[model samples]
Target chain A: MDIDPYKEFGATVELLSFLPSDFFPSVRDLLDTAAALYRDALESPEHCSPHHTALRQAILCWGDLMTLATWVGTNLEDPASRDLVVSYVNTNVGLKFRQLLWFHISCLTFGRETVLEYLVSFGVWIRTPPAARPPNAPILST
Target chain B: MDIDPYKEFGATVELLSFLPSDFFPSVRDLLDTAAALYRDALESPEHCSPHHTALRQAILCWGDLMTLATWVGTNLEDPASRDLVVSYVNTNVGLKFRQLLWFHISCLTFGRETVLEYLVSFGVWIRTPPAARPPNAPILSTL
Candidate 1:
């Protein structure tokens, strides 16, 4: 099967782009579409064929696009933007959202082998001594 | 402040309890209020005093409650529930939301030291062998 990942994802992005109203929606739309497509691709019959390779490439491109757009796009200081994220995960219940964002999507953009194969770990975030943790509710001020 | 941690948290939880529309909202509302409060609690002038201690306890309790409620409350298999989470993260854009859910909030429940402190790390997920890596989009079936 002949496939153009660039054209496919470009269209995919464009098509899903209109769904969400603003900036955040656009981001979510991409994730939603790509992740959903990724899910279906898993369900497809057989692997290693040209069809499967084409499907995988489109997803990789999507992940790359998201990484470029979000990771490099914005630092996201606004509470409104953060709140939407907070609310998203908060309400998400028990879906293990972190794996998707940190691991699943990370692999998508970076590549399965090195995505996780490459990076082993990172340090934990901490406040200075005397100003250490258990400091009131951050969400309260948020 | 003569804050009884139990009473304060019980009151906080009860008060915030009714704000959200349902389960997911309830969870979001708690994180919103708690994280927001934790932010302010840090701003308080002094530390190490009874007042600060008291203030901190309530927040800890809130985290514990959330942990019990969400972590132990349910395994959450329903799509509606998971979608709410997916949507929440999807639209939020650019905030390090994971830090709060995985780190900050986690610390609250497990203690600043152990939530992450005690447990240094875990492992990466994989599909393995022939079935491994880059499955098709997971959200296509979702609306």
Candidate 2:
């Protein structure tokens, strides 16, 4: 049977539980450690930890965030949402995921950033008018 | 009328052609940019970029990737597809986005090494499919 991957699947509420309050701390620590690894990789490429060495080598092979982002853009069903995310990062975050695999990692790693931000914004906007908020408050803030 | 906002939007599809494929040069560049912006906000007590800063300073910030992801996730349907993508990212890319932004980014950036190793392994597995190989093709070499 022929299938169109682009076909919409409807609303996905699985990620409603994800919010900045829930995941920011871990993300921060992860980045901090990675940054240090990056510095070490720069100074002593050969004397780095196994993980850092792998990352450094991967960087050499992959390209950048664009790679990861592109992968999401192509693979995911919600193109607009994903595109907005890419725009959000590129316009506001100052980065673009150009490659497929690299973008895959970037998206997988910090992919929730987009979800949290979107929920927070929607929550705040919906709160200004209680009646305007989406019914059942399906959007999770915590 | 009890409407689930998260599930109210119906189904959605994210296309790859929507984003730029030339802005990044390497995986490090992607991690560096995400780290610089995401890390600074978490590490420091001061305000940073107004658009993409992760301080929850704005109810509607301009550059939060999580926000965008949430929007898509909430609006998307097809449990299998949703989980497929999320699982692919979480397992292959190494970001455990189980209700935590920090862990997601942290794992994504810091767990780069582990993720890369997995990707390399996955790539090797994919490239070595048995059905596509010729009868006399070398085991290590590809046709």
Candidate 3:
């Protein structure tokens, strides 16, 4: 099946944005898009391939992480949520997250060049040039 | 304030024995001796060193891990416990455990030689020698 790279990339960005902070008003949008793309990727042909499977699993894992974060964020003042969060932090929860990250990174190492080329071609990966000097300023490089 | 390494190590071993499926009835004696010697080593003049601290911390962390494992193991059939475990596994709990293990490993790397020598001197570290002389006997390694 044909997959829209742009849509997938957009969903990826949205899902990533939910990580640093939970106060995003568009969290629902992010979650829905991530969930949809995760399903799509799982059923796609690439799902059968290890490299692509890792990519999809990584996205799904991030979505799960965001869901947990959302639960804590929404119930920040709730005692039960606080207890759960405290217990998780004090236990092995962090190790699980790290493991998932490592899994994804390892997968990327196997297919980094291909993944980067795909993203760049889709315009999802962009490079920013260094800031410009003030008007009339001399060029830094000789 | 003086801490009793023997007592702490004993408690640690006892707690550890409760994890999933390890049967060690004589663990108490082993722990008692380990704790006593640990205390002795700590009270030694070199106890004021980073190597000693790392060894102590590594043991303490293992004790904590075992404690957590025991809690999960004991409550395995409970719904609430199941939920908590499910949520943890689904989330980032494994990563946290990995991070702790890495931290301990890093400490060990920093004082590997010294820590091993100290433990061996106290008879806390032992090497098994391999031997086999009987028919159908299990092969054991000796060092």
Candidate 4:
């Protein structure tokens, strides 16, 4: 199979193509709007917090792209298998909508294995007693 | 603060009393029915699949008792601290729900510390062969 390296790195384009046509355009449109909003916010920082600013930039730069990795992890061909990954993302979205900007960036930039390894590392980090866990939950190491 | 063992264990029960009255009887009735179902299923082979039968029996026999220890580990008073425990449970709920069910039973029958150590031992089970990983996913430590 021929692979395009640019397509691999260009997460939004990659994720949009993977999605069914019906769902693709809307999410793409929403993201496009978000991008515009993000740019405006960046040029004028009076409206948002540092966390929001960092998160918005991360989402545009990496989070959206990581959706490609999430697509690969979910294996769009299998609904049940795909739903598991979607459930994880959806649940995390509910948990930390703000952090997702960074989380998805991590997912895209690092890919699945590294993202999972990070979560494992997060579990280890908590043992030291001061590091704050990601929003919504604790790390339960196996 | 004077703590009551029954009340601590009765966390679910105490919450039930505070629930709206209209649903109270129905909820109690459902629990009673489920309890009867549990008792009947214990002796009947048809109620459970062969794979789940042993696990279900073990859970009833001991898993119910370990909630206190798990709750203690939770230390829910501090939001930040509770988030850590809840997140761990959330991650593990996906990663090791089956293992946790077994762990809960083991903790009840064996001891809390034993089960805690067992979790450490269980860490090795997530190994996925190279072929199972996605084509683009980075390779991490695998034995």
Report the number of the highest-TM-score candidate.
2
lDDT tens digits, residue span A1-142, model 3 = 1111112222233233323332222323433443443444444433233333333433344444444444543444255554553354334544433333332333344343443343343333222222432233221121
> What would the per-residue lDDT of candidate 3 be over residues B1-143, giving only the tens digit for each residue?
11122121122222222222222223234334335544555334332333343343333333444445455445356566557654554334333333323322333344434423333332321223235233332211222
Instruction: List model 2 lDDT by residue over A5-75, tens digit each.
Output: 11111112222223233323332343444454344442342422222222332232222234445566667
In order, candidate lDDTs are: 0.32, 0.34, 0.36, 0.34
B133, model 4: CA deviation in Å?
A: 40
Native A-B interface contacts kept, per candidate: 0.00, 0.00, 0.00, 0.00
- State how far residue B59 of model 2 sits from its true place (Å): 22
lDDT per residue for candidate 1 within B1-143, as digits (tens), equals 11111221122222222222221323445456555645554334333222233333233333433442253215345656545544544433112222223333444444543432222211111223335534532211111
- Looking at chain B only, the TM-scores across the models are 0.27, 0.24, 0.31, 0.29
What lDDT is reached at residue A90 by model 2?
Answer: 53
Name the candidate, 1 or 3, with the larger TM-score value: 3
DockQ for every model comes to 0.01, 0.03, 0.02, 0.01
Residue ranges of candidate 4 with Cα displaced over 4 Å = A1-33, A40-53, A57-69, A73-80, A98-142, B1-143
DockQ, candidate 1, comes to 0.01
lDDT of 3: 0.36
For residues A5-120, write the lDDT of model 4, one tens digit per residue.
11212222232233223322233344454555444543342323322333333333233223432543353325555544334443433223333343333443455356555555
Best by lDDT: 3
